[PDB]
Design an enzyme around this catalytic site. Structure first.
Site, PDB file in Angstrom:
ATOM      1  CG  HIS A  32      -2.015   0.833   1.205  1.00 30.94           C
ATOM      2  ND1 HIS A  32      -2.032   2.072   2.103  1.00 30.94           N
ATOM      3  CD2 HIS A  32      -3.077   1.221   0.217  1.00 30.94           C
ATOM      4  CE1 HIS A  32      -3.205   2.939   1.609  1.00 30.94           C
ATOM      5  NE2 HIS A  32      -3.690   2.296   0.663  1.00 30.94           N
ATOM      6  CD  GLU A  76      -0.546  -4.480   1.600  1.00 31.29           C
ATOM      7  OE1 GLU A  76      -1.204  -4.604   0.337  1.00 31.29           O
ATOM      8  OE2 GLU A  76      -0.439  -3.171   1.909  1.00 31.29           O
ATOM      9  N   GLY A 122      -0.805   4.651  11.280  1.00 35.96           N
ATOM     10  CA  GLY A 122       0.722   5.097  11.745  1.00 35.96           C
ATOM     11  C   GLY A 122       1.521   3.979  11.905  1.00 35.96           C
ATOM     12  CB  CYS A 150       1.068   0.622   7.710  1.00 34.86           C
ATOM     13  SG  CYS A 150      -0.645  -0.108   7.771  1.00 34.86           S
TER      14      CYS A 150
HETATM   15  C1  LIG Z   1      -1.547   1.540   8.234  1.00 38.55           C
HETATM   16  C2  LIG Z   1      -1.346   2.327   7.192  1.00 38.55           C
HETATM   17  C3  LIG Z   1      -1.837   3.930   7.303  1.00 38.55           C
HETATM   18  O1  LIG Z   1      -1.698   4.391   8.407  1.00 38.55           O
HETATM   19  O2  LIG Z   1      -2.397   4.482   6.503  1.00 38.55           O
HETATM   20  C4  LIG Z   1      -1.893   4.299   5.041  1.00 38.55           C
HETATM   21  C5  LIG Z   1      -2.099   5.313   4.098  1.00 38.55           C
HETATM   22  C6  LIG Z   1      -3.046   0.912   8.467  1.00 38.55           C
HETATM   23  C7  LIG Z   1      -3.146   0.487   9.689  1.00 38.55           C
HETATM   24  C8  LIG Z   1      -4.735   0.403  10.348  1.00 38.55           C
HETATM   25  C9  LIG Z   1      -5.496   1.627  10.154  1.00 38.55           C
HETATM   26  C10 LIG Z   1      -6.662   1.376  11.167  1.00 38.55           C
HETATM   27  N1  LIG Z   1      -5.972   0.612  12.032  1.00 38.55           N
HETATM   28  C11 LIG Z   1      -4.685  -0.208  11.632  1.00 38.55           C
HETATM   29  O3  LIG Z   1      -4.112  -1.191  12.237  1.00 38.55           O
HETATM   30  N2  LIG Z   1      -3.308   0.336   7.362  1.00 38.55           N
HETATM   31  C12 LIG Z   1      -4.322   0.537   6.535  1.00 38.55           C
HETATM   32  O4  LIG Z   1      -5.084   1.562   6.706  1.00 38.55           O
HETATM   33  C13 LIG Z   1      -4.870  -0.482   5.364  1.00 38.55           C
HETATM   34  C14 LIG Z   1      -6.458  -0.295   5.404  1.00 38.55           C
HETATM   35  C15 LIG Z   1      -7.101  -0.985   6.866  1.00 38.55           C
HETATM   36  O5  LIG Z   1      -6.437  -1.462   7.610  1.00 38.55           O
HETATM   37  C16 LIG Z   1      -8.647  -0.753   6.675  1.00 38.55           C
HETATM   38  N3  LIG Z   1      -8.890  -2.162   7.430  1.00 38.55           N
HETATM   39  C17 LIG Z   1      -9.659  -3.111   6.821  1.00 38.55           C
HETATM   40  O6  LIG Z   1      -9.742  -3.033   5.653  1.00 38.55           O
HETATM   41  C18 LIG Z   1     -10.072  -4.225   7.617  1.00 38.55           C
HETATM   42  C19 LIG Z   1     -10.729  -5.550   7.319  1.00 38.55           C
HETATM   43  C20 LIG Z   1     -10.763  -6.104   8.667  1.00 38.55           C
HETATM   44  C21 LIG Z   1     -11.480  -7.435   8.662  1.00 38.55           C
HETATM   45  O7  LIG Z   1     -10.141  -5.720   9.471  1.00 38.55           O
HETATM   46  N4  LIG Z   1      -9.666  -4.279   8.947  1.00 38.55           N
HETATM   47  C22 LIG Z   1      -9.105   0.486   7.206  1.00 38.55           C
HETATM   48  C23 LIG Z   1     -10.397  -0.014   7.832  1.00 38.55           C
HETATM   49  C24 LIG Z   1      -8.395   1.068   7.972  1.00 38.55           C
HETATM   50  C25 LIG Z   1      -4.425   0.395   4.334  1.00 38.55           C
HETATM   51  C26 LIG Z   1      -4.739  -0.762   2.824  1.00 38.55           C
HETATM   52  C27 LIG Z   1      -3.648  -1.551   2.613  1.00 38.55           C
HETATM   53  C28 LIG Z   1      -4.133  -2.357   1.329  1.00 38.55           C
HETATM   54  C29 LIG Z   1      -4.916  -1.962   0.392  1.00 38.55           C
HETATM   55  F1  LIG Z   1      -5.140  -2.621  -0.672  1.00 38.55           F
HETATM   56  C30 LIG Z   1      -5.764  -0.937   0.741  1.00 38.55           C
HETATM   57  C31 LIG Z   1      -5.622  -0.257   1.933  1.00 38.55           C
END
Ligand SMILES: *[C@@H](CC(=O)OCC)[C@H](C[C@@H]1CCNC1=O)NC(=O)[C@@H](CC(=O)[C@@H](NC(=O)c1cc(C)on1)C(C)C)Cc1ccc(F)cc1
Length: 187
Positions: free
Chosen positions: A40, A71, A145, A147
């Protein structure tokens, strides 16, 4: 308890702050000049490493034989420092784990450690709308923050953090055979 001493040694010698146009990420260096970052982050042909602009010599967004996102992106970087070789700390197989630590290295959090508890082989995850495989799950409210954050137990580096829903955290597996040394046109 949790392996804080192990996580610290990995953070000290094998992490850097990486910055793409998508933001900042913890980046784990694995060996020589090869590191990993969540796919991502959308790595291009240069990246900021500890705020220093760096040529990305190679970048490989890993996918499995179902053509599903894993990923993980592996990068080769043009920089003088060699990373300590930590491949021998990588798991050979998929597994569950006890009492893991999630370790972050960003500008906002230059080093921070979060005990996430048990880690289970989760499998399929719809990650922000992208099907993804080989996912590890912990019941911890991880946040934006974190990731790239390194997930360890003592002796093993098992994943990098990629997602979370406010209740569970998810990491992409790291497997030893991702980093072993044929002839392949891969772009
Ligand atoms: C880390 C990256 C960040 O800070 O933003 C990136 C621009 C982030 C960590 C999570 C955010 C909320 N809590 C965390 O631990 N990762 C992301 O934002 C990915 C997207 C998500 O985590 C989504 N969550 C889900 O899809 C999900 C599904 C289930 C069962 O549980 N959670 C959002 C709700 C935050 C970024 C990402 C990765 C790969 C992709 F193809 C698209 C988006």
């Amino acid at each position: 308890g949790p392996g804080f001493d192990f996580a610290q040694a990995i953070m000290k010698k094998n992490t850097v702050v990486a910055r793409t146009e998508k933001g900042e990420f913890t980046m784990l260096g694995v060996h020589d000049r090869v590191a990993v970052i969540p796919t991502h982050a959308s790595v291009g042909e240069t990246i900021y490493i500890n705020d220093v602009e760096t040529k990305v010599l190679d970048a490989c967004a890993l996918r499995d034989l179902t053509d599903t996102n894993l990923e993980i992106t592996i990068v080769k970087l043009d920089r003088n420092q060699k990373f300590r070789d930590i491949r021998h700390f990588l798991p050979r197989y998929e597994d569950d784990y006890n009492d893991a630590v999630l370790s972050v290295h960003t500008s906002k959090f230059p080093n921070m450690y979060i005990p996430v508890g048990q880690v289970t082989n989760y499998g399929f995850l719809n990650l922000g709308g992208t099907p993804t495989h080989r996912i590890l799950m912990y019941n911890f409210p991880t946040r934006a923050g974190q990731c790239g954050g390194v997930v360890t137990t003592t002796g093993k580096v098992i994943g990098i953090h990629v997602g979370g829903n406010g209740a569970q955290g998810f990491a992409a597996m790291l497997l030893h055979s991702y980093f072993t040394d044929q002839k392949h046109h891969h772009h």
